mmCIF file of C-alpha atoms in Angstrom:
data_model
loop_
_atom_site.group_PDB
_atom_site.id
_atom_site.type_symbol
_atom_site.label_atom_id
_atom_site.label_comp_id
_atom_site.label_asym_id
_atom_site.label_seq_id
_atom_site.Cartn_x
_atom_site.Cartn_y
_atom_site.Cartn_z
ATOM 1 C CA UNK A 1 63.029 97.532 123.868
ATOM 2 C CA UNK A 2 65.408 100.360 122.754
ATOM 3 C CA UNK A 3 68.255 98.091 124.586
ATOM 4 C CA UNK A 4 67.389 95.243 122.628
ATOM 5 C CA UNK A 5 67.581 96.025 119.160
ATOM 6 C CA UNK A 6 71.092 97.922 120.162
ATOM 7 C CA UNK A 7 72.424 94.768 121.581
ATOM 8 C CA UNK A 8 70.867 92.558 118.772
ATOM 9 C CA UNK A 9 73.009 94.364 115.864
ATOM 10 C CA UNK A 10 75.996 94.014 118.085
ATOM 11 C CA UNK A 11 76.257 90.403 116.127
ATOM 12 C CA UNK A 12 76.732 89.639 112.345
ATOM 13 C CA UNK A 13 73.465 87.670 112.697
ATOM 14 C CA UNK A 14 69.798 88.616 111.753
ATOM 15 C CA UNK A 15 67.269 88.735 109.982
ATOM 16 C CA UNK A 16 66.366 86.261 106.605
ATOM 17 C CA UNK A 17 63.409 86.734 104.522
ATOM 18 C CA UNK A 18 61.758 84.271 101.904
ATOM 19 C CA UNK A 19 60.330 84.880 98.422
ATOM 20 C CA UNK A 20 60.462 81.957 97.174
ATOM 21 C CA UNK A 21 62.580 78.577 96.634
ATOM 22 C CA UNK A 22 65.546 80.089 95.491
ATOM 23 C CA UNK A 23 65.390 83.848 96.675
ATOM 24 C CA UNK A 24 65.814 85.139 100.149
ATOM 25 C CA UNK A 25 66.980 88.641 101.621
ATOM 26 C CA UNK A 26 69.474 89.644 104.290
ATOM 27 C CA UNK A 27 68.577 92.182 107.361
ATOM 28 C CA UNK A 28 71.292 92.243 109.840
ATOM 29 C CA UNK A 29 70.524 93.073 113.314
ATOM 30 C CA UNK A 30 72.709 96.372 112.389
ATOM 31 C CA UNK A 31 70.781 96.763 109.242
ATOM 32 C CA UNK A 32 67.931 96.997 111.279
ATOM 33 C CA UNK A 33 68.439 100.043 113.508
ATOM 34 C CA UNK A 34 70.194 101.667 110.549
ATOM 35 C CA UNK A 35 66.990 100.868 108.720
ATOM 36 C CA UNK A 36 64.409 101.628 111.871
ATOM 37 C CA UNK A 37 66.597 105.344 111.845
ATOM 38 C CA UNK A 38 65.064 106.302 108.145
ATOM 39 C CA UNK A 39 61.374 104.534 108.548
ATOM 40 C CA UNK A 40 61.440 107.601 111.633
ATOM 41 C CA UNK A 41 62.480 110.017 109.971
ATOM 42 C CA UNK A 42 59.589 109.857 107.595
ATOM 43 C CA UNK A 43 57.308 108.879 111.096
ATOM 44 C CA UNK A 44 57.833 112.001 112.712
ATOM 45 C CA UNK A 45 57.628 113.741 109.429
ATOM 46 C CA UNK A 46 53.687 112.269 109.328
ATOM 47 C CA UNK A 47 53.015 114.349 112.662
ATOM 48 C CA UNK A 48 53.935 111.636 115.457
ATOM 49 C CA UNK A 49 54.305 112.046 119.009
ATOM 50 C CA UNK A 50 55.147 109.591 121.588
ATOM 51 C CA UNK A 51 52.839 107.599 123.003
ATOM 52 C CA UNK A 52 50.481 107.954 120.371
ATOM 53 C CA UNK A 53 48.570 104.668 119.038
ATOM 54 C CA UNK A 54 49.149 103.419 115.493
ATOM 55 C CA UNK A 55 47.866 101.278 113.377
ATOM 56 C CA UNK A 56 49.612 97.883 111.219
ATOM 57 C CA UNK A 57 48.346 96.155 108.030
ATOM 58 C CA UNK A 58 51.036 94.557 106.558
ATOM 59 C CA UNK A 59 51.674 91.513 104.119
ATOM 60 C CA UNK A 60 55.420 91.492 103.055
ATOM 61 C CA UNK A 61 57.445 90.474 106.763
ATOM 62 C CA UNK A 62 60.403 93.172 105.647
ATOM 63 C CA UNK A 63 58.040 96.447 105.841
ATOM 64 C CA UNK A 64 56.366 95.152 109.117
ATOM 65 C CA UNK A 65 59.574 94.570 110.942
ATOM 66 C CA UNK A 66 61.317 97.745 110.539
ATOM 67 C CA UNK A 67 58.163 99.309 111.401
ATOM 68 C CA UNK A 68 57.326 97.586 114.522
ATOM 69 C CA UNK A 69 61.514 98.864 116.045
ATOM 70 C CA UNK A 70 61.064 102.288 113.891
ATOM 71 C CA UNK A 71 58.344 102.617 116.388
ATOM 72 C CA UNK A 72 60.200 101.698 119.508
ATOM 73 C CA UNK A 73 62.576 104.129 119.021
ATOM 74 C CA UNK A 74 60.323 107.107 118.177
ATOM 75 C CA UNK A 75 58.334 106.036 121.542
ATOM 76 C CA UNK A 76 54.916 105.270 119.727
ATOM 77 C CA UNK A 77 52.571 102.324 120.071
ATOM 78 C CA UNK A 78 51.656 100.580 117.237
ATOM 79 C CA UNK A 79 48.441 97.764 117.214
ATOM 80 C CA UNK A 80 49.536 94.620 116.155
ATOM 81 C CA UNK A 81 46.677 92.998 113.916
ATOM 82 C CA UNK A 82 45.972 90.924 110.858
ATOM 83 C CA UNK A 83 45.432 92.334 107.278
ATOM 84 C CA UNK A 84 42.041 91.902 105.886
ATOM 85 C CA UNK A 85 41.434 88.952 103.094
ATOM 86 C CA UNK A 86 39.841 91.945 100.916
ATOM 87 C CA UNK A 87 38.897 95.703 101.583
ATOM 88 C CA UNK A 88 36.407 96.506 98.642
ATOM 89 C CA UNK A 89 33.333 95.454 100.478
ATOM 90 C CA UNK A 90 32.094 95.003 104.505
ATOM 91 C CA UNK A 91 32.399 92.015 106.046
ATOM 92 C CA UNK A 92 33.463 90.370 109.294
ATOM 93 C CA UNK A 93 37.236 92.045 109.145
ATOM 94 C CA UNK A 94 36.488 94.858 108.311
ATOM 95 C CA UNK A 95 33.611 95.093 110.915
ATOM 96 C CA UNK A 96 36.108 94.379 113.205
ATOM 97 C CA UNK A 97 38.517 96.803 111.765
ATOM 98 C CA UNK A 98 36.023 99.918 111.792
ATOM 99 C CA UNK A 99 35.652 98.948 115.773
ATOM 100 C CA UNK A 100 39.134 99.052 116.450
ATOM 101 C CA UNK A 101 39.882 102.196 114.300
ATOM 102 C CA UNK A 102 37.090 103.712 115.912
ATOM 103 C CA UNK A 103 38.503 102.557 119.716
ATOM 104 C CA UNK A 104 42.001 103.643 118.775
ATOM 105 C CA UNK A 105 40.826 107.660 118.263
ATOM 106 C CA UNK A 106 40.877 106.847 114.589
ATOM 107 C CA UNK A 107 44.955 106.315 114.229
ATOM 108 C CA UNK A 108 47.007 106.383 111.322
ATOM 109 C CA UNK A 109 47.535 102.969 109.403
ATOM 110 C CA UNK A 110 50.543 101.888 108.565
ATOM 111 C CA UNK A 111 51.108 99.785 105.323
ATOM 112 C CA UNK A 112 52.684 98.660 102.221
ATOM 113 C CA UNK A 113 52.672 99.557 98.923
ATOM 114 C CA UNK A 114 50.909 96.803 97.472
ATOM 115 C CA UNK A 115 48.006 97.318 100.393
ATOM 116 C CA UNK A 116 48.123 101.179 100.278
ATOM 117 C CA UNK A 117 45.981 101.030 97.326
ATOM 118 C CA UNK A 118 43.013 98.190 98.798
ATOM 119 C CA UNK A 119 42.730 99.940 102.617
ATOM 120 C CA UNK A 120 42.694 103.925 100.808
ATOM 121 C CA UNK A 121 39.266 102.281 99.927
ATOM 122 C CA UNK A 122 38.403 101.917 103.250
ATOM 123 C CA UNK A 123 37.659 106.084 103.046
ATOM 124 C CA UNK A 124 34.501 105.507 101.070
ATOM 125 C CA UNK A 125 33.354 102.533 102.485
ATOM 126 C CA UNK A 126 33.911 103.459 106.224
ATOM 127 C CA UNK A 127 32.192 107.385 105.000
ATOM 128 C CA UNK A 128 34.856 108.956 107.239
ATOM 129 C CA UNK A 129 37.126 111.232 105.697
ATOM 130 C CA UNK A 130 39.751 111.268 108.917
ATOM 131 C CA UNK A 131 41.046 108.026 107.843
ATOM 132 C CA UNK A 132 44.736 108.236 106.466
ATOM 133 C CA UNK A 133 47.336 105.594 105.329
ATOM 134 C CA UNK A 134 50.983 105.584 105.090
ATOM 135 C CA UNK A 135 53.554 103.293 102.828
ATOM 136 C CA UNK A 136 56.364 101.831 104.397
ATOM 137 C CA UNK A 137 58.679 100.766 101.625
ATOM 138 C CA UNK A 138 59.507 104.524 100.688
ATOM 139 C CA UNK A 139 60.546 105.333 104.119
ATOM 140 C CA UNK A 140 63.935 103.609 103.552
ATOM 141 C CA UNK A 141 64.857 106.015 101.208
ATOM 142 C CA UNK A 142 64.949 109.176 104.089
ATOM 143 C CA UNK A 143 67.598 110.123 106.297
ATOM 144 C CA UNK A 144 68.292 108.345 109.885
ATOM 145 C CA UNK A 145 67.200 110.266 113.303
ATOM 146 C CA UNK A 146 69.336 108.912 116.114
ATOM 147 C CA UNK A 147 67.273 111.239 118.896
ATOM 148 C CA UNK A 148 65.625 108.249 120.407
ATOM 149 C CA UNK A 149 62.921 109.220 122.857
ATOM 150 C CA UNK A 150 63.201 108.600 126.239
ATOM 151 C CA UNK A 151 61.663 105.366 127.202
ATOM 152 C CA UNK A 152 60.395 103.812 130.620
ATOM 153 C CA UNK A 153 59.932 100.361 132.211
ATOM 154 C CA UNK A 154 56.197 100.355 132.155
ATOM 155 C CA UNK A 155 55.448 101.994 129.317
ATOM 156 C CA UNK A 156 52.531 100.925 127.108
ATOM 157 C CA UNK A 157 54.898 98.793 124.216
ATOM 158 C CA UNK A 158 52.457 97.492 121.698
ATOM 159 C CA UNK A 159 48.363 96.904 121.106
ATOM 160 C CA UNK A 160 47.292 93.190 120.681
ATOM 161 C CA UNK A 161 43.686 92.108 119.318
ATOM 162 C CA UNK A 162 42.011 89.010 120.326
ATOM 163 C CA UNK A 163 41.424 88.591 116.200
ATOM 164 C CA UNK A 164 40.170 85.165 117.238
ATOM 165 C CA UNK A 165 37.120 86.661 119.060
ATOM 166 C CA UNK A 166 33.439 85.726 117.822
ATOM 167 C CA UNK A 167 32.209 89.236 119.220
ATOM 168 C CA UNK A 168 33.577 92.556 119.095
ATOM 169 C CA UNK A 169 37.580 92.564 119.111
ATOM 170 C CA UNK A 170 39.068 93.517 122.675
ATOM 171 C CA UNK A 171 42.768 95.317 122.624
ATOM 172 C CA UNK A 172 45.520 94.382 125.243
ATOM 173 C CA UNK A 173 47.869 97.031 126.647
ATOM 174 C CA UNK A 174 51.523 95.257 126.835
ATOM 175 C CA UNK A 175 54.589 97.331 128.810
ATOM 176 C CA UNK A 176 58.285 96.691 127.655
ATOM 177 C CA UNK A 177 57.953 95.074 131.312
ATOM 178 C CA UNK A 178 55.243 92.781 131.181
ATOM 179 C CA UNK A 179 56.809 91.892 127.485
ATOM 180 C CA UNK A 180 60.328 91.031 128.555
ATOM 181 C CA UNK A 181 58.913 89.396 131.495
ATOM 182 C CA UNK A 182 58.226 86.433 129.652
ATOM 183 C CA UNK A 183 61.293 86.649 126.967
ATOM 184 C CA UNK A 184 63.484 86.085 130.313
ATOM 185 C CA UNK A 185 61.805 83.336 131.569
ATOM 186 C CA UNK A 186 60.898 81.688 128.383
ATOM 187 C CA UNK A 187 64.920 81.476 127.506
ATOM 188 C CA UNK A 188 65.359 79.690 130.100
ATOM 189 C CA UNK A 189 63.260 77.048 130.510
ATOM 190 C CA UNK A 190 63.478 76.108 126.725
ATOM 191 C CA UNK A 191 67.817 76.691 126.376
ATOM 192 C CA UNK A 192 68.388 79.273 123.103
ATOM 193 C CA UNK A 193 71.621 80.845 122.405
ATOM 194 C CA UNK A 194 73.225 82.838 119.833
ATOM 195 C CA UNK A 195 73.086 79.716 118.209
ATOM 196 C CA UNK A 196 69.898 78.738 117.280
ATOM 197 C CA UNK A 197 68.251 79.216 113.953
ATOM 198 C CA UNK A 198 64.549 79.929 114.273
ATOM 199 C CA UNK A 199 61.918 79.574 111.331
ATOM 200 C CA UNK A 200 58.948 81.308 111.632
ATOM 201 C CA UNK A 201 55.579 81.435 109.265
ATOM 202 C CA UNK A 202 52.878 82.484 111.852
ATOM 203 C CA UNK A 203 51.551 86.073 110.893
ATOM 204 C CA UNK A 204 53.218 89.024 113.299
ATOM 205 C CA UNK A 205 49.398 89.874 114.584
ATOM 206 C CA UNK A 206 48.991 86.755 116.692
ATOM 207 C CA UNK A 207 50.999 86.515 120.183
ATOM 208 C CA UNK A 208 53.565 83.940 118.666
ATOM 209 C CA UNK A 209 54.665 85.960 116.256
ATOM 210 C CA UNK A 210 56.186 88.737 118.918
ATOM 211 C CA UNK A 211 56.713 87.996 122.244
ATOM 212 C CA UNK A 212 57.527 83.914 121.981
ATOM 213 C CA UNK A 213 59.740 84.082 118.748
ATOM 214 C CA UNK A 214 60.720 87.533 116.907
ATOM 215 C CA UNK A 215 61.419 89.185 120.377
ATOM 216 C CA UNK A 216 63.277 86.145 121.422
ATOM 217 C CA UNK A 217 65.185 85.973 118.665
ATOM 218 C CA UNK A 218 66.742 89.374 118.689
ATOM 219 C CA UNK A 219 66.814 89.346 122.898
ATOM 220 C CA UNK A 220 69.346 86.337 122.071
ATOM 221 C CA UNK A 221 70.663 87.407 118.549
ATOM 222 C CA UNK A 222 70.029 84.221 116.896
ATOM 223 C CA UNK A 223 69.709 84.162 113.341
ATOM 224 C CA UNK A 224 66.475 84.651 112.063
ATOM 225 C CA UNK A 225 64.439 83.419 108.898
ATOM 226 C CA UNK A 226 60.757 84.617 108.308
ATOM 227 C CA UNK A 227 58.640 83.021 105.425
ATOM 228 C CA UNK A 228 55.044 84.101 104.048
ATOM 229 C CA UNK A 229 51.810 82.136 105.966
ATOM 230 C CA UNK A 230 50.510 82.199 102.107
ATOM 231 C CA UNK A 231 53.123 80.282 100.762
ATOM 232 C CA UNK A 232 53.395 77.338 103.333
ATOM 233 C CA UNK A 233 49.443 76.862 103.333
ATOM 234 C CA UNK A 234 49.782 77.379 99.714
ATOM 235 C CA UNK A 235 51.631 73.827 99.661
ATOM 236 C CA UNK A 236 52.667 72.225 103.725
ATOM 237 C CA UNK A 237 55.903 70.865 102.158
ATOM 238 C CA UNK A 238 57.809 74.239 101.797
ATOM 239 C CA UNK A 239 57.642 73.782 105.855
ATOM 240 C CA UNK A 240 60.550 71.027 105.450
ATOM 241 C CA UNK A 241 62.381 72.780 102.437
ATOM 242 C CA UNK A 242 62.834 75.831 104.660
ATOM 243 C CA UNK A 243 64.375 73.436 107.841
ATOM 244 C CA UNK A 244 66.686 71.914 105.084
ATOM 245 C CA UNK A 245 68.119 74.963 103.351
ATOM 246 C CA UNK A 246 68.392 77.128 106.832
ATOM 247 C CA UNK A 247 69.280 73.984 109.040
ATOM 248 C CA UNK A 248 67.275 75.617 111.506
ATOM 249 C CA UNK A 249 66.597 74.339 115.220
ATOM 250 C CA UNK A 250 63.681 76.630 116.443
ATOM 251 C CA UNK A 251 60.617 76.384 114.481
ATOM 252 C CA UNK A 252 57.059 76.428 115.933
ATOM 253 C CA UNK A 253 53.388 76.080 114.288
ATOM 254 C CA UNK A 254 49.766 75.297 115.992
ATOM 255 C CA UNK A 255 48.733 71.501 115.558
ATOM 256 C CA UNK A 256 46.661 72.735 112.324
ATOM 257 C CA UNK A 257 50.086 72.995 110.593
ATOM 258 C CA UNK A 258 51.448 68.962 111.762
ATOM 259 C CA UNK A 259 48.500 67.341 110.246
ATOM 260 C CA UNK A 260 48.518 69.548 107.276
ATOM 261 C CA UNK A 261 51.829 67.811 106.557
ATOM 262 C CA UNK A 262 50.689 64.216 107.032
ATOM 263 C CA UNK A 263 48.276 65.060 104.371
ATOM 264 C CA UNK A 264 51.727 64.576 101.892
ATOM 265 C CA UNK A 265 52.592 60.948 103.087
ATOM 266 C CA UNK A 266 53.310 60.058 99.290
ATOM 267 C CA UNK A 267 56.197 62.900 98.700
ATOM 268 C CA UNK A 268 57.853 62.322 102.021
ATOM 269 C CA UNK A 269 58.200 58.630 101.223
ATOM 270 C CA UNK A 270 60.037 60.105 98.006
ATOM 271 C CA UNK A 271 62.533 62.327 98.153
ATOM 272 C CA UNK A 272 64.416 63.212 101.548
ATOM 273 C CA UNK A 273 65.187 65.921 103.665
ATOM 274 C CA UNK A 274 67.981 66.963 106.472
ATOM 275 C CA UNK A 275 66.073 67.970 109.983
ATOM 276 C CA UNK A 276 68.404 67.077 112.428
ATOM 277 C CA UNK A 277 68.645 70.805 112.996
ATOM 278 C CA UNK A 278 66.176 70.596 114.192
ATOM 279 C CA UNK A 279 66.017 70.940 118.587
ATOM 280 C CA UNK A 280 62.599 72.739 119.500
ATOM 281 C CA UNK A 281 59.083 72.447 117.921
ATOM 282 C CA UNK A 282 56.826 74.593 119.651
ATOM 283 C CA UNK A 283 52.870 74.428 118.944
ATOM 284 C CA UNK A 284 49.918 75.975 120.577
ATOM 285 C CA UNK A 285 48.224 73.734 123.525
ATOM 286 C CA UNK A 286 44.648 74.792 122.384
ATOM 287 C CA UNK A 287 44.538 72.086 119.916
ATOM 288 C CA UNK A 288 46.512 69.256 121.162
ATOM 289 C CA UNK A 289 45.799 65.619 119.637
ATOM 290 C CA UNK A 290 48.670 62.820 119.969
ATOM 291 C CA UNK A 291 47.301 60.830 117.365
ATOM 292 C CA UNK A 292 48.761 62.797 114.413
ATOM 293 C CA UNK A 293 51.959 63.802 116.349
ATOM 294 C CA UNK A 294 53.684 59.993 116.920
ATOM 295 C CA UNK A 295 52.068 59.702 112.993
#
């Protein structure tokens, strides 16, 4: 992965991210590793080694991103999972979450600043005093570290949950091998370049938000816009706004999101939109109905 983000911020393109109609914020490629440097300078600070396992909760798509390379180039392996809907009391996440912490030899957690506060709670709930947090958004205020760690082909990369799992979560072991396996192959039966623009919404936990588009878009160096999940469900129609202002021709969302939209049929019958920019809509197969994609 190492060879990856190096290449990436060999282009002008990058990273876009969305606060709201009329704000955004710029992370070029080269911005990135600069960026990735100073998050691991405060990672090794923590106590890290390579190799060992660490843990995401993340809401703002900045803090996550940096975190996910400032790991790649310190050589850990960080576990890619949702943030809980609310820490204060036990519940199905955080059942979940207490298995997985308790899996991963109780790992670090890596956060925000506006979560740091909600998962520190986790302490008295869980009754284990060997849990520990960490803010990202402080981190990019620390020097860089350009001693990369040595990394090798089949190398553990990244921990995925199956979040979507009625019983107790499983993790997945992925190596920078098995990962760039498919980023080859799925450039090439789909066509992206340097070129394309690619929206995404879907949170960074699920296996869309990695490996099909993020990783894909810095493998290619295509420029890159990431928007909130809360703000799209929060009102379907930003979904077209975004396509408009970005003229973007890589988007994807499961069939969930399509008929959301439908549900507007009065507002898109008044006042238009550009989406010829559009060139590839991806959406997950395990929900696939027809009817409400000719609608």
């Amino acid at each position: 992965l190492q060879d990856v983000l190096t290449e990436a911020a060999k282009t002008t393109n990058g990273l876009t991210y969305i606060v709201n109609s009329k704000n955004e914020l710029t992370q070029s490629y080269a911005q990135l590793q600069g960026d990735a440097e100073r998050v691991l300078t405060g990672l090794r600070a923590l106590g890290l080694k390579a190799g060992d396992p660490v843990f995401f909760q993340f809401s703002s798509n900045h803090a996550m991103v940096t975190a996910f390379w400032a790991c790649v180039l310190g050589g850990f392996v960080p576990t890619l999972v949702s943030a809980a809907p609310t820490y204060r009391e036990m519940n199905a996440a955080v059942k979940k979450l207490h298995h997985a912490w308790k899996l991963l030899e109780h790992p670090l957690i890596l956060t925000d600043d506006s979560l740091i506060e909600e998962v520190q709670g986790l302490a008295f709930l869980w009754h284990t005093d060997q849990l520990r947090v960490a803010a990202v958004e402080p981190m990019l205020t620390l020097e860089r570290d350009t001693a990369a760690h040595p990394a090798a082909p089949d190398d553990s990369v990244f921990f995925i949950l199956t979040s979507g799992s009625t019983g107790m979560p499983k993790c997945v072991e992925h190596s920078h091998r098995s990962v760039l396996a498919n980023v080859k192959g799925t450039v090439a039966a789909n066509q992206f370049t340097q070129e394309d623009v690619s929206l995404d919404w879907m949170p960074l936990d699920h296996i869309g938000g990695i490996v099909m588009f993020h990783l894909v878009n810095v493998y290619t160096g295509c420029e890159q816009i990431r928007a909130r999940t809360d703000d799209f469900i929060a009102q379907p129609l930003r979904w077209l706004d975004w396509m408009d202002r970005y003229r973007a021709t890589k988007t994807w969302a499961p069939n969930f999101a399509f008929a959301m939209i439908n549900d507007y049929e009065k507002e898109i019958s008044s006042g238009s939109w550009d989406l010829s920019a559009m060139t590839c809509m991806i959406n997950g197969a395990e929900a696939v109905v027809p009817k409400t994609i000719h609608r």
